[PDB]
């Protein structure tokens, strides 16, 4: 009821044994009443590592998108080693979403690595179960066995109706996903552990399908973008391997489903100044001259009768002399061109002082030999060239034309394919102009270039006019155990890709949310634009180039920091060599670096002085020692992970305050949220995701099931908790309900339609479904629905949530009125009460933990010791936690060696892995998540609690209690002890 206190553990240890004499009764009672639950005490185990690989094929759908819906690919298995290193080999194949699917090596939620199907963003199959939301559901297939060698899996995806189907060895899989969120792009993915060998088959050039695709399903290889070539790559990574060594890599840039749609500017309604009959005709004539010259250069000629094989121009007259349609074609050509120019900031004109007469119009080498020759060339480029802004303007004109073209192509119903197929309405060039290759970019620009030069010669006066913030930065720092408070130290940073990198010395208490140098916690240098940041910005030094090494030295004797670029010391504007001076030592300094989107770098601390470059040039004889030189093992580094998680609200938070009021008359214990700086300057308003620190767990079996009636109170199972919205706070900006442990969405524009949801349906052989289970991670109701029923109303809004742990359903009421919204869940599920609110008043919300007639309070559900106590109470363990976007994580010392290489045009792309890699995981029972045990090196409270837990284990096992030792052997096994014996970190 109070929390994790080591003093209680010490009390139990003193209970066990005193003065060298063991009390067997106390030891047995403690072992019986503490160990079997496997809750409230941290757990330890050994797990394997899981890595995922994708084929770099992104497919999705949107309104007016240029992509295709149905897709299908093949995966074959060559070698599988069952039970490698005491654990079953992991191998799953499926689809993953671009946004939200960012697995990391180690840690994770659910007693091990996630892989495919352990989150609501990925869907997978492993030969016996369907995996989604970290939940496995058995499925019936003619061949029911785990993924074996020489087994082939066919994976298809339909976007018109959300449904992912699998087919093993031709035999269909009776289970299918449905009704999943369509935001983002889907890509194939395979997750695996050490000891596997698989091969992707996308058809066409790369691989051959073992079984024919279902009708209407296109091969995956047809979805490759023209700008890129096929290549196997991991999903996401914060490091890579190179000849220099481990290259730290920043966040990557990914496309979106809305990027493929064309969004041009309509110009048909645009009116034009009186320039049509004045200069539009002249522009048309110039276009005719250039186009006829192009024909004359080739074998095309002008015969009286139009013919293609005979090379005969239809008009066959020097002057175009076209009839109404043919002439109006070029008339509308130039009209649309002028309309596009006027739609943008460019303003057309003809102020040239009769420069048309001054034009040459005589470049006739007599190469023409027929009627439609003598096409004058104005030599407009020779007179005046095109400015860079003019060339850019040509570029956006071509882009606008291509975009409107793609718009009609989508309107008729065309789609994109890597292979051209006219009967199939598939065109490999209808992607947006940015996504087009340079060949078609040049092909759709020459005529516009000529027209724009004509405009220049004619005197045209046209003149050209939160959540993502965390995802665009990545910080790597040395571990807090390597802080230096004396001496002179040096390290190096190589910038492989120039731009958006910031290297320097930070402090142990540096936060991951804030940028480097924004706060006083870091002294950093930015070489992309050549400045130094301690608190603010100030120019210093020169920008770097690709392959440049910057050496950072710090001396705490002189309290200075010096940055050198390629062996030369950078100096400020005044000429001072030291970038910073008069720096208090404080608690020490650590090496730190920050990388932006699509950036790579090499952080060389200098374990081996031979590999350290430019050290002898500057630093060796100046008395500086390389950082981390004499240590035997490489430095463990911690990186800034952008996975949102719920953390307790700090008591010193400047903006939000939590009050704990209880025991009042006619009011149950409650927790009230208040805004400290509302209605004042320097106040920030944003979405706030709050939850309770303790969950309520449903029963294993769903076997049905004035003053309060005691018999019903003892026989009831329902529970109640309410949320009060104070007057002045808009009910339209509150969502009240429950959240599963796996909720990691920090959307600033949260809506009830943005929640995850997926229905898994099991069918029979004939296709008659018999089970359809819905899975999500957020069960809430919106206050907008209640207020709409009916300015600021003095009456508060009370929303009460009722749950039934036996039946398995939850209902919602507002102001004592039953609401139509209800939810149903599955057994063995734990939900935390939660509210998502946008503050708009000084008083925001109040969690009330009370009770109703014949309904029991949440305290009994949360705490076992008070299961039969109807009196509401708020023990100190119950607390309000808020979502936090960014956190710190520990980089693993070793990583899997995944080898990817195309086997052949008929074999596909082969992926293999054989080197085992295991880790020790510490699991929190209530939160249902685990982290690496080495992460306790910085978590000094969990470390102390676990040490006292081990002491308690020794105490209960002390003095020849062999039965208790046998019982303990199940909790801590031989393998864990042997692994921990040789654990050097």
């Amino acid at each position: 009821k109070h929390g994790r206190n080591h003093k209680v553990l010490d009390v139990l240890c003193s209970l066990c044994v005193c003065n060298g004499v063991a009390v067997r009764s106390n030891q047995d009672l403690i072992t019986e009443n503490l160990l079997p639950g496997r809750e409230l005490l941290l757990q330890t185990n050994l797990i394997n590592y899981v890595t995922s690989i994708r084929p770099n094929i992104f497919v999705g759908r949107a309104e007016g998108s240029t992509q295709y819906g149905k897709w299908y690919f093949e995966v074959m298995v060559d070698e599988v080693v069952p039970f490698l290193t005491a654990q079953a080999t992991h191998l799953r194949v499926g689809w993953a979403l671009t946004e939200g699917y960012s697995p990391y090596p180690g840690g994770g939620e659910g007693w091990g690595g996630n892989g495919v199907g352990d989150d609501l963003y990925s869907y997978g199959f492993d030969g016996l179960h369907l995996w989604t939301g970290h939940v496995a559901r058995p499925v019936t297939s003619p061949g029911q066995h785990l993924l074996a060698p020489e087994d082939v899996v066919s994976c298809c995806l339909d976007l018109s109706v959300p449904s992912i189907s699998f087919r093993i060895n031709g035999c269909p899989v009776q289970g299918v996903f449905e009704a999943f969120n369509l935001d983002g792009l889907f890509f194939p993915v395979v997750s695996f552990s050490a000891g596997v060998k698989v091969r992707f088959l996308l058809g066409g050039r790369h691989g051959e399908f073992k079984f024919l695709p279902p009708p209407g399903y296109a091969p995956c290889h047809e979805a490759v973008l023209p700008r890129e070539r096929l290549r196997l790559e991991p999903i996401k990574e914060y490091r890579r391997e190179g000849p220099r060594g481990p290259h730290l890599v920043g966040p990557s840039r990914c496309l979106s489903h809305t990027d493929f749609v064309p969004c041009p500017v309509d110009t048909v309604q645009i009116v034009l100044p009186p320039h049509l009959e004045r200069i539009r005709e002249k522009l048309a004539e110039n276009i005719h001259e250039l186009w006829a010259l192009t024909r004359i250069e080739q074998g095309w000629t002008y015969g009286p009768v139009r013919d293609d094989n005979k090379r005969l121009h239809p008009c066959l007259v020097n002057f175009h002399s076209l009839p109404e349609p043919e002439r109006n074609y070029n008339l509308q050509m130039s009209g649309e061109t002028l309309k596009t120019l006027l739609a943008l900031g460019c303003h057309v004109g003809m102020a040239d002082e009769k420069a048309e007469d001054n034009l040459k119009k005589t470049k006739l080498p007599k190469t023409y030999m027929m009627s439609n020759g003598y096409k004058p060339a104005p030599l407009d480029l020779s007179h005046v060239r095109l400015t860079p802004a003019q060339t850019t303007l040509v570029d956006r004109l071509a882009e606008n034309g291509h975009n409107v073209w793609a718009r009609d192509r989508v309107a008729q119903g065309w789609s994109y394919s890597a292979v051209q197929d006219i009967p199939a309405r598939r065109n490999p060039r209808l992607v947006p102009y940015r996504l087009l290759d340079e060949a078609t970019k040049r092909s759709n620009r020459d005529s516009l270039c000529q027209a724009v030069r004509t405009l220049l010669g004619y005197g045209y006066n046209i003149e050209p006019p939160n959540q993502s913030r965390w995802d665009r930065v990545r910080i790597f720092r040395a571990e807090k155990s390597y802080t230096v408070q004396s001496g002179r130290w040096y390290f190096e940073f190589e910038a492989v890709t120039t731009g958006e990198m910031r290297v320097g010395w930070a402090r142990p208490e540096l936060r991951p949310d804030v940028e480097l140098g924004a706060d006083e916690l870091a002294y950093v240098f930015n070489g992309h634009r050549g400045q130094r940041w301690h608190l603010g910005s100030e120019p210093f030094g020169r920008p770097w180039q690709s392959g440049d090494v910057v050496g950072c030295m710090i001396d705490l004797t002189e309290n200075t920091i010096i940055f050198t670029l390629n062996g030369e010391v950078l100096m400020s504007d005044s000429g001072s060599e030291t970038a910073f001076r008069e720096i208090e030592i404080g608690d020490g300094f650590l090496p730190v670096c920050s990388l932006g989107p699509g950036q790579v770098g090499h952080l060389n601390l200098g374990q081996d002085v031979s590999s350290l470059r430019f050290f002898a040039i500057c630093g060796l004889q100046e008395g500086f020692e390389p950082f981390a030189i004499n240590m035997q093992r490489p430095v463990t580094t911690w990186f800034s992970k952008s996975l949102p998680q719920f953390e307790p609200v700090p008591p010193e938070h400047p903006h939000y305050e939590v009050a704990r009021m209880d025991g009042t008359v006619d009011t149950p214990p409650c927790l009230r949220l208040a805004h400290r700086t509302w209605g004042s300057q320097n106040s920030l308003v944003e979405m706030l995701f709050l939850r309770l620190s303790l969950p309520v767990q449903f029963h294993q079996h769903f076997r049905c099931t004035n003053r309060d009636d005691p018999e019903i109170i003892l026989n009831t199972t329902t529970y109640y908790y309410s949320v009060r919205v104070f007057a002045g706070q808009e009910p339209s900006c509150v969502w009240v309900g429950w959240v599963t442990p796996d909720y990691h969405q920090h959307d600033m524009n949260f809506d009830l339609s943005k929640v995850r949801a997926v229905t898994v349906t099991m069918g029979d052989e004939q296709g008659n479904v018999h089970s359809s289970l819905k899975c999500s991670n957020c069960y809430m109701v919106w206050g907008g629905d209640f207020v709409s029923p009916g300015r600021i109303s003095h009456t508060d809004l009370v929303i009460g949530c009722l749950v039934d742990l036996a039946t398995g359903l939850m209902t919602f009421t507002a102001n004592g009125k039953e609401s139509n919204t209800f939810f149903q869940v599955e057994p063995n599920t734990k939900l935390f009460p939660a509210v998502f609110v946008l503050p708009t008043h000084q008083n925001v919300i109040q969690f009330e933990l009370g009770k109703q007639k014949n309904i029991m309070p949440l305290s009994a559900a949360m705490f076992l010791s008070e299961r039969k106590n109807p009196a509401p109470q708020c023990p100190p363990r119950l607390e309000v936690q808020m979502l936090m976007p960014v956190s710190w994580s520990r980089m693993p010392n070793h990583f899997l060696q995944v080898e990817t290489r195309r086997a052949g045009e008929r074999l596909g792309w082969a992926v293999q892995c054989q080197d085992p890699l295991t880790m020790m995981a510490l699991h929190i029972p209530e939160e249902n998540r685990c982290m690496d045990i080495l992460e306790l090196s910085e978590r000094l409270d969990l470390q102390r609690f676990h040490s006292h837990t081990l002491r308690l284990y020794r105490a209960v096992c002390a003095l020849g209690n062999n039965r208790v030792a046998h019982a303990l052997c199940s909790h801590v096994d031989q393998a864990q002890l042997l692994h921990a014996l040789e654990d050097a970190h």
Partner: nanobody
Amino acid sequence: QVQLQESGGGLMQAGGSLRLSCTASGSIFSINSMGWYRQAPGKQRELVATITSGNSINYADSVKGRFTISRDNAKNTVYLQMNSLKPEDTAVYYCNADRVPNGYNPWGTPNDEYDYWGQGTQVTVS
């Protein structure tokens, strides 16, 4: 959107007369060059005589026989007549409208690929 509904060209013996009606329903702008294509079963797609606004007709190899193609811009109606027949003439005919006039286009690929196909109909010769 410009939709070209093409109906006619029923099964007839050699020498029979076939009438095909093509109607292009859509925006009146860029209505021109209501050309014709034909794809033989499992063979290449050839170009039938293309008629454009202004009474301009362009012939090719596939126009062999008695081909009379006439178009009306008032209602965007093309009345193709094939008085003779040959066994090789069996193909799926399509009526296609393209903004490109008389097969000439000084604009470039963006307007060359600006094309509006049609459903078409199957013409069979015994």
